[PDB]
Swiss-Prot record, chains A, B:
Major localization listed first in the record, in broad terms: cytoplasm
Residues of the full protein shown: 1 to 262 of 350
Name used for this protein in its record: Glycogenin-1
Organism of provenance: Homo sapiens (Human)
Physiological role: Glycogenin participates in the glycogen biosynthetic process along with glycogen synthase and glycogen branching enzyme. It catalyzes the formation of a short alpha (1,4)-glucosyl chain covalently attached via a glucose 1-O-tyrosyl linkage to internal tyrosine residues and these chains act as primers for the elongation reaction catalyzed by glycogen synthase.
Subunit field text: Part of the GYS1-GYG1 complex, a heterooctamer composed of a tetramer of GYS1 and 2 dimers of GYG1, where each GYS1 protomer binds to one GYG1 subunit (via GYG1 C-terminus); the GYS1 tetramer may dissociate from GYG1 dimers to continue glycogen polymerization on its own. May also form a heterooctamer complex with GYS2 (via GYG1 C-terminus).
Length: 263, 263
């Protein structure tokens, strides 16, 4: 419980750090009894690292790992995601026996400590290619062996998508066809994209959401929020604004719970 | 080899009948040893029913079942899909021990007779909400009981999406959490939408595709094809055209095998 198990996130800059701060605050809001840890890289300002230390039990400094895999990253219109190979450092955290990695663009809506009943590698399906798991939420076991194996495969073969999700799916390739218990229910990693892609399903299953994941190039922190009206201002033709409940929650927590700690 | 087992499709009009014909032609092309069955409703022309008899072993006339659920259908911008409850008639086919239902907008790329090793209900995940199965390819056991249960649920509750897929997911509730063997690999029902949603995944898994599913409002038969050049004429800004190989194959089979029976 308290000592040997953690939620782990990652930030390589101050932008994704506002995400990590909101994630962290949401985990506390829902009364986790596990540690909170964030992996941070040198591009995170000293000032931000100090703020991160008020929310996370530990801020762990690591080196950026970058795929440099511009062809594969362009293939999915995510030229900026090569630095997500930095996620692989999560397996080096052998101070813990089991952890849940969560993307810095996630938000917790309910206690999810029952994830620690799972075993490596448990993750939810990805809505793009559902025989791949989405790497935004996964339950794993820190291991120097698994760490080095993952580093080796990344250096030798890279990632089919140029980020962490490809390589993690290739390494944990039995996921689609194994033990159904290793398929986390989709409500533990609810892709913002699924809300508009199959709204009828969201309408009957979404009230049970435990985690929302703002996956895709547009992040909550790239909107403009007016605290007085609670209005979110978006770019034109944004399909996520037809169901904005999770975006508003994100901003509520940031303005209320994170903002006071920033100053 | 199975005289007591069939593939089953559905058509309510002459337009999806072109799809059924191409699907049936593709099952023959890949040497199925099973029977081929199409459910058709009164709106299919007499001349079309006769053409369907050259491809399918059985053309079975059934009444249209229509949810009339404009609210849920409109939720997913598919106002025409209420007649998909007609699919429920497939459970009445107790001449067969086991069947694979396939949507009329599917296209077989390899022999898939190994699907008959599965048991009801086996289906692939839906890319919008992957804890629901897509109802375009599924293995089931004809049964008067299951048939009547499904009709009663449709009459009482309707479908959460106004079509067959919602009601079938509600009825086969345990799919997301049961027996992984009942999760068909995504290659047995490859959603055309998944090609452009996670292109990197397509690039490394796509060569293994056994079935493609042209799901969504635009169907292969709504394009304009030039057989001289083998170019497909699309509506503007069509995302599927960046990877057109499956559409081209649909039109080749249509033009070579099917259109001669029509025009
Ligand atoms: O510039 C970046 C890009 C990503 N990340 C980390 O890598 C994760 C995966 O990236 P993202 O969530 O943007 O991928 P997606 O969920 O959109 O596929 C993020 O949540 C962050 O934890 C980061 O720290 N800096
Ligand atoms: O007007 C219609 C619409 C649907 N269908 C049948 O119902 C299936 C499901 O509809 P569709 O494939 O359009 O749904 P999607 O796969 O796009 O969700 C089709 O493949 C056909 O077999 C039909 O016969 N007539
Ligand atoms: Mn993410
Ligand atoms: Mn279909």
């Amino acid at each position: 419980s308290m000592t040997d198990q953690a939620f782990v996130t990652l930030t390589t800059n101050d932008a994704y750090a506002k995400g990590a701060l909101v994630l962290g605050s949401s985990l506390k809001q829902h009364r986790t009894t596990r540690r909170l840890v964030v992996l941070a890289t040198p591009q995170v300002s000293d000032s931000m690292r100090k703020v991160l230390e008020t929310v996370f039990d530990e801020v762990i400094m690591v080196d950026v790992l970058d795929s440099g895999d511009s062809a594969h990253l362009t293939l999915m219109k995510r030229p900026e995601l090569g630095v997500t190979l930095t996620k692989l450092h999560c397996w080096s955290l052998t101070q813990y026996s089991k952890c849940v990695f969560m993307d810095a663009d996630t938000l917790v809506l309910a206690n999810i400590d029952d994830l620690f009943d799972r075993e490596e590698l448990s993750a939810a399906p990805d809505p793009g290619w559902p025989d791949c798991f989405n790497s935004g939420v996964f339950v794993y076991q820190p291991s120097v062996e698994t760490y080095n194996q993952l580093l080796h495969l990344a250096s030798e073969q890279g990632s089919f998508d140029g980020g962490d999700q490809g390589i993690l799916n290739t390494f944990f390739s039995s996921w689609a066809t194994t033990d159904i218990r290793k398929h986390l229910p989709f409500i533990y990693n609810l892709s913002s994209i699924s809300i508009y892609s199959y709204l009828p399903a969201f309408k009957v299953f979404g009230a049970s959401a435990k985690v929302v994941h703002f996956l895709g190039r547009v992040k909550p922190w790239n909107y403009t929020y007016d605290p007085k009206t609670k209005s979110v201002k978006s770019e034109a033709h944004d399909p996520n604004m037809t169901h904005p409940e999770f975006l508003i929650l994100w901003w509520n927590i940031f303005t209320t719970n994170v903002l006071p700690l920033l100053q």
